[PDB]
Amino acid sequence: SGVEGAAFQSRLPHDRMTSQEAACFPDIISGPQQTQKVFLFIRNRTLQLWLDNPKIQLTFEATLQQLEAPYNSDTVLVHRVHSYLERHGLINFGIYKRIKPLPTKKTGKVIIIGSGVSGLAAARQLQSFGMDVTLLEARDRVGGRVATFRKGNYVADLGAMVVTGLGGNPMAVVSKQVNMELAKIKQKCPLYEANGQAVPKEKDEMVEQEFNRLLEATSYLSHQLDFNVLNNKPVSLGQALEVVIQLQEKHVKDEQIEHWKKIVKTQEELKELLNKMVNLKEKIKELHQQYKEITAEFLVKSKHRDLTALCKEYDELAETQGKLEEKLQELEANPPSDVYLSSRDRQILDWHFANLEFANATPLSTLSLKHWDQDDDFEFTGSHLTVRNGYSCVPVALAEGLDIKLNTAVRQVRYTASGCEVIAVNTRSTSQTFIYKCDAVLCTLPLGVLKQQPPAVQFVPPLPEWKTSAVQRMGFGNLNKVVLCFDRVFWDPSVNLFGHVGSTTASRGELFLFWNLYKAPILLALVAGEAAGIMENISDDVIVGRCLAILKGIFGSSAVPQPKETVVSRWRADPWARGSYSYVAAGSSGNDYDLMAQPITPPIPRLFFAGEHTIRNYPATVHGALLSGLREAGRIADQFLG
């Protein structure tokens, strides 16, 4: 299934046309289904040709010469499919050799706000389409939230560092184009408690099992019993989790109660049984006395078959007594669980919640119970990988040949029914400003900058209410890293990651996870959830000291030398980001991502949007950013080039 795999790798069903293709090829969708079969094959085959060699431009001509008969005869259809694929960034995207050099005459001018992956991806597309494009970047580097530290042989990412499974991932193509080295993340993640001792395989698995069960429960509660609103306030994932935990504790307490009652009941039956036996002994004594006084040949017989009958009674009770002392001791030896989670178990469980806070870049109490995993259905297949040589290799290579103006911060964006003006200032001399005129503006401003109050950049006219309302509802998280560069490796080189279990629920996200990913002796420590924003207020030295303390508790002091180099990110305080990435906040939904993607048009579309926050099925990702850029380049070219 070569062509079939090509469609998969392109996130398209191989045997049916998408709604997009239906709209662009209405004559095919509403026509002979045999022609649709032909359409799909041309489409799947063209994708295969491009995917099999993503370093070279796939021209219409080369596509035609590589298609087998009878397909190579339907010249017009092939061109229509090739044009569509190319326009929408499914082929000829990223970085590749052009066999058809760009035309000197550039049509239409577009200003791209932001030199991150979304802006870079859109820029390269728009340029290859023959448009005049210039990127305005506030920083003194490209890449935005993809940021790599490089010094000597030391390499470390302060922003994006993980690639999520290549099957269907556009980054698979970009990886090949820039020769980026990817290493699969080994699953083994040993956990160490606050005292530094490792958590036994048993408990680790047990608690991880409970974590999974608790999450599954919140999903059942949400997508079955429709428990998504309470007191008119949307329910958060954190909220639902604590409720599920409470029920588990209630259930444990109930089975404990019932058990104690079995004990008490058995204990009462015994006391009462012992009491009638004591009375039967007193009744036997009444006989082993008195009994012994000439008709006796019949009086002794009588007193005998009488005194014995009282033993066919007594030791008979000692029997029905042994069946209780047995039942009793059996119960007081097999007690149900005393608690749902021991104090130590709860801390380990909090580590798993912190991990989830890292993945969504926000405390669980802010996540939408109903929509936090709204995009799960779009995950790519395969192991998640890490960028051994620094993720910045992508934006750096994508910037090749582009007209990028660094140290240029945009402060105003004017858009009228007949053109656009973008005002920016030099960040090195806020005295001098710049005024760039253009036909269209592509804003790849991070959601955190768009939420900023007072606003960092002004829109004239101001953005619509349906747009600003979406920006306000959507969540924008935070996550930070501490890069520790050593001259020696004192950790287990075969382990990619290991966790640090915090002491309290509130600080569970503080330096809870360490990553071993590079050539040089470098460790990355994460700061998630509530800890992320707070720790930004701590100086590098103090935060590094707390890292070494964690490390020394694990590997022993004297084993951990002082770091030669350290880097600490503070994404929330970074004025060009104001956070790490978006998340679906309680009260928001995947629809806000669609609203974020909508162009603003006063008589015709003028202001466009790209960025990790404008792509519903792939939010908060580098690939999502990439795709949003390809998407917008297509929408813009359609408007200005037709």
Binding-site ranges for ligand FAJ (CB under 6 A) = 113-119, 136-139, 144-146, 159-162, 164, 409-410, 444-446, 449, 457, 479, 571, 576-577, 580-581, 611-612, 620-623, 625
Q: What number of CA atoms fall less than 13 Å from residue 189's CA on the CB side?
A: 17
CB of 19 to ligand FAJ, least distance (A): 25
CB of 564 to ligand FAJ, least distance (A): 23
Smallest separation (angstroms) from ligand FAJ to the CB of 411? 7
* Pick 61 or 594: Cβ nearer ligand FAJ: 594
Taking only Cα atoms into account, the Rg of the chain, rounded to an integer number of angstroms, comes to 35
319 marked ligand binding residue: no
Show the DSSP H helices in 70-187 as ranges: 75-87, 117-128, 170-178
**171 annotated ligand-binding residue:** no
At which residue do the structure tokens 């395969």 appear? 382
After which residues are there C–N gaps above 2.5 Å in the chain? 293, 602
Minimum distance of ligand FAJ from residue 212's CB (angstroms): 19
Label the pairing between strands 440-443 and 607-609: parallel
Q: Which is nearer to ligand FAJ, 145 or 352 (CB)?
A: 145
β-partners of residue 460 are: 414
Nearest to 392 by CA among 150, 625, 183: 150
Ligand-binding annotation for 139, yes or no, is yes
- To ligand FAJ, the closest distance from the beta carbon of 158 in angstroms equals 6
Crossing angle (nearest 10°) for helices 117-128 and 622-640: 30
Residue 145 assigned as binding residue: yes
Residue 410 CB, shortest distance to ligand FAJ, in Å, is: 3
Nearer to ligand FAJ, 551 or 568 (CB): 568
In sequence order, what E strands does 21-126 have? Answer: 109-113
Closer by beta carbon to ligand FAJ, 215 or else 457: 457
Shorter beta-carbon distance to ligand FAJ: residue 340 or 608: 608
Query: In angstroms, what is the minimal distance from the CB of 359 to ligand FAJ?
Result: 7
In the bound state with ligand FAJ, the residue whose beta carbon lies nearer, of 215 and 532, is 532
* CB-nearer residue toward ligand FAJ: 549 or 573: 573
Unique residue bearing structure tokens 């200003």: 111
Which SS3 state, helix, strand or coil, does residue 508 take? coil
Q: 268 a known binding residue?
A: no
Beta bridge partners of 562: none
Least Å distance, CB 593 to ligand FAJ, is 12
DSSP assignment letter at 487: S
Residues pairing with 516 in the sheet: 523
621 marked ligand binding residue: yes
Count of other CB atoms within 10 angstroms of residue 189: 18
Residue 410, Cβ neighbours under 10 Å: how many?
24
Closest distance to ligand FAJ from the beta carbon of 358 (Å): 7
Q: Which is nearer to ligand FAJ, 340 or 571 (CB)?
A: 571
Taking the complex as a whole, the smallest distance from the CB of residue 461 to ligand FAJ amounts, in Å, to: 17
At residue 413, φ and ψ (nearest 5 deg) are: -135, 110
Indicate the residue among 210 and 509 with the shorter CB distance to ligand FAJ: 509
Prior bond to 200 cis, omega within 30?
Answer: no
Q: What's the closest the beta carbon of residue 155 comes to ligand FAJ, in angstroms?
A: 15
199 vs 442, beta carbon nearer ligand FAJ: 442
Please indicate if the annotation marks 17 as binding a ligand: no
Sheet holding 132-136, edge to edge: 404-405, 132-136, 109-113, 440-443, 607-609
Nearer to ligand FAJ, 24 or 532 (CB): 532
**First vs last Cα of the chain: how many Å apart?**
35
CA distance linking residue 265 with residue 267, whole number of Å: 5
Give the CA count within 13 Å in the CB-facing half-sphere of 343.
3
Q: Are 590 and 475 in contact (CB under 8 A)?
A: no
Position of tokens 């004594």? Answer: 285
- Tell me the C-alpha distance between 614 and 463, whole Å: 15
Locate tokens 């935990």: which residue?
Answer: 245
Is 162 assigned to a binding site? yes
**DSSP bridge partners of 148:** 157
Total length of the chain:
642
Listed residue (339, 341, 279) closest to 310, CA to CA: 279
Cβ–Cβ < 8 Å for 375, 11: no
**Joined tokens for residue 81:** 């499919």
Burial, 250: exposed, middle or buried (Cβ in 10 Å; 0-12, 13-18, 19+)? exposed
For ligand FAJ, the closer of residues 6 and 385 by Cβ is 385
To ligand FAJ, the closest distance from the beta carbon of 408 in angstroms equals: 6
Whole-number Å distance between alpha carbons of 47 and 3: 8
Instruction: Answer yes or no: is 565 a known binding residue.
Output: no
Q: 375 or 439: whose CB is closer to ligand FAJ? A: 375
| Closest approach of ligand FAJ to the CB of residue 116, in Å | 2
Residue 122 — φ and ψ, nearest 5°?
A: -65, -45
**Kind of pairing between the strands at 132-136 and 522-527:** unpaired
Binding-site sequence positions: 118, 137, 139, 145, 161-162, 612, 621-622
Binding-site sequence positions for FAD: 118, 137, 139, 145, 161-162, 612, 621-622
